[PDB]
Amino acid sequence: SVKSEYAEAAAVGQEAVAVFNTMKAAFQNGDKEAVAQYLARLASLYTRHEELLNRILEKARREGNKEAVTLMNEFTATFQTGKSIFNAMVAAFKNGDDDSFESYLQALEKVTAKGETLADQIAKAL
Ligand SMILES: NCCc1c[nH]c2ccc(F)cc12
């Protein structure tokens, strides 16, 4: 069901949270080799999550589930904000700009925290 598809996408999202928090610890510790690997892992996780969210949104559209479509449109917009900040984080890592990396990291956390009440609303709407 689209609802089990959303649970699967939610689990992929929680996996990125776990890896993100491990990566933050590695960044603080100056373990740059670990950070590089975690950032590759996060890029794959976000790419997979984005694709699952699109399939869920398209399915809700095909189902005429207008409330779910509204919430998913808002959610995928916020998701792209996270993605842009993530990509900027990766560039800051490549550039050796630890100040920007710190800034982007905090921002990604607040964008992710803010978007959680909406994430729970979608689960109920689908
Ligand atoms: N963006 C936070 C403020 C800051 C200024 N300079 C920095 C160098 C490294 C770092 F992790 C953080 C900073």
Side-chain angles (χ1 to χ4, degrees):
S1 83
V2 75
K3 200 170 302 181
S4 69
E5 283 150 20
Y6 189 68
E8 291 144 36
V12 171
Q14 287 315 103
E15 188 176 332
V17 166
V19 178
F20 179 91
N21 281 331
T22 304
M23 176 274 295
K24 174 173 166 182
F27 168 71
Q28 296 173 354
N29 291 324
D31 183 357
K32 292 181 70 171
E33 301 201 13
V35 171
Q37 285 169 263
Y38 294 133
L39 292 174
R41 192 73 167 187
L42 288 166
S44 176
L45 281 162
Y46 294 143
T47 289
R48 169 76 164 159
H49 196 189
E50 176 175 2
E51 204 265 314
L52 297 183
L53 290 167
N54 284 337
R55 286 165 25 185
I56 288 153
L57 167 55
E58 292 155 12
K59 187 151 168 170
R61 283 171 184 155
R62 285 194 308 271
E63 283 176 357
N65 187 342
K66 290 188 184 95
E67 185 55 38
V69 168
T70 294
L71 302 173
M72 281 293 297
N73 279 334
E74 297 172 329
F75 191 76
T76 46
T78 304
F79 183 96
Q80 291 293 326
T81 303
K83 177 177 172 183
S84 296
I85 291 168
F86 176 73
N87 286 336
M89 203 172 60
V90 171
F93 182 67
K94 171 181 189 193
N95 280 336
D97 179 358
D98 283 354
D99 172 84
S100 301
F101 194 87
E102 298 151 22
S103 178
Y104 291 137
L105 196 143
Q106 288 205 33
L108 185 60
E109 279 171 332
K110 293 171 203 170
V111 154
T112 297
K114 279 192 180 62
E116 285 329 295
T117 58
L118 180 53
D120 278 7
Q121 289 180 227
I122 293 163
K124 289 155 182 169
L126 280 175

